[PDB]
Amino acid sequence: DHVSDSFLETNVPLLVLIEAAKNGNEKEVKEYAQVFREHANKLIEVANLACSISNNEEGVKLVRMSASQLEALCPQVINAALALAAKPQSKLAQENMDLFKEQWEKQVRVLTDAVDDITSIDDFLAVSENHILEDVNKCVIALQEKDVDGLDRTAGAIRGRAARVIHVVTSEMDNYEPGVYTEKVLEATKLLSNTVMPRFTEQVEAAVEALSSDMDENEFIDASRLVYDGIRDIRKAVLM
Template identity: 45%
Template sequence: MNGVNFLQVVNAAYLLSVRDSQVARDNMEAFKNAWIEKMKLLTMAVDSMITVDDFLAVSEAHIIEDVKSGIQAVINGDGYLLDRSAGGIRGRSLRVCNVVDSEMDLVAASSYRDRVRMATKLLRDDVINQFSDRAEKVVNKLENEATEGNNDENRNYVDDVDEFIEASELVHNAVKEIRNALLMNRNPEDVDSDNEYEDDAGTNYPDSRNQVTDIENEQKIMRQLPEEEKRKIQEQIDVFKIAQSKFEREVAKWDETGNDIIVLAKHMCMIMMNMTDFTRFVLLRIESFEELIVRLYATWIV
């Protein structure tokens, strides 16, 4: 039993499905319990090797990947894949709550611990339920469309995609709030933030001493910002990530041969580039604003 692996669990389940008997049922139960116990030990070992900050960063990245997979499932009309993606998001979110709560068990009672626990409670008791309900509605809609034979390529899936993105955004924001709550009690120098831009000393400036001073001043300013301002900045970053996902989804739908809008957009881009280059070198040599307009118009006509 010490060498139990996933394949043995699958084989035991297969035997149980082929021949329903008490022996097969007991065999399945034994392998299942052994597998679960080994997975718990593995999880505990991994948790002891990484910090909670790194765990949250990785969890956020995996949630974003699940969201992308779910969006593609909606576009393809695949209710089964969407259900799996939504289940992955729920599972990762609950795992975040469990890990952070375990971390808080080691912290003395304080307003800091209360805030972190409040953030995890919000995710577990409220946000996950909202996400599950909204995702389930989209899954049911896709399954009904598949049953009725309406899941062709010309169907309108924009509303379903937006609904799934908005539901996923609730989860992502809640996880971000947990991470922000954890960072409230940390020394900024001890945290590797993925939201800070640190220049490499001596790369952009000839004097490395000036570079160090500039970095210290920027970090000092960021630390002095009110928490509300920091939260607003983080919200804008989150909105940008969601907008980026929407943009990538829209770009993936079209290619140059499938839509004349792409060709037109490229042509307009070339025009704007020509106009920019034109004004960059000619602006200082023109006699009036009217002359600039005339020259720009002539460039556009060409």
């Protein structure tokens, strides 16, 4: 491997590219467009290596796709810049730039987390901690905005990732010689699957119950935060 999120996640070349084009600096635009591209290719090559050594079928598919969409978008982004550099004034040109910027940053993020999910268990558990806590914050928020859809989909994304964590780690422990280490990891996963997730789902269904009908907000927040704690406990246990 030998790569950091720092390299994978950066949109710096993009941002800087957009800055040039923003002020008709045709010179640097062609300079930055080249760094952008070079960065994207390396990102795609790194992603390619991650796959070869990986056994995860679905995990690789995700990386492949995410990597493809980056190839397709790249040219579109550079060109969209040249369209702005030539007409920094063109309101149309500006909009396209940002829209492309969003599309690009979302895929770069998808790619980072995807590559990380197949790099190693700690990486996978680290990504799992971020998505979970972020999904938890969204849930809490969706609940407060009585956004049943948000709550429902977000709580679903949480259950899916936690179930994925539970399977990947329990499965992982199967490769080790049973001991204090492994038993402590399994204790932590069973805590999540047998006690914490159920109560969480219990909270969600009830929240989606009231809302779509004629509750304790702090209860939900506690139940949800607990899902994050069980994930962190699993990760820590696995780091022993």
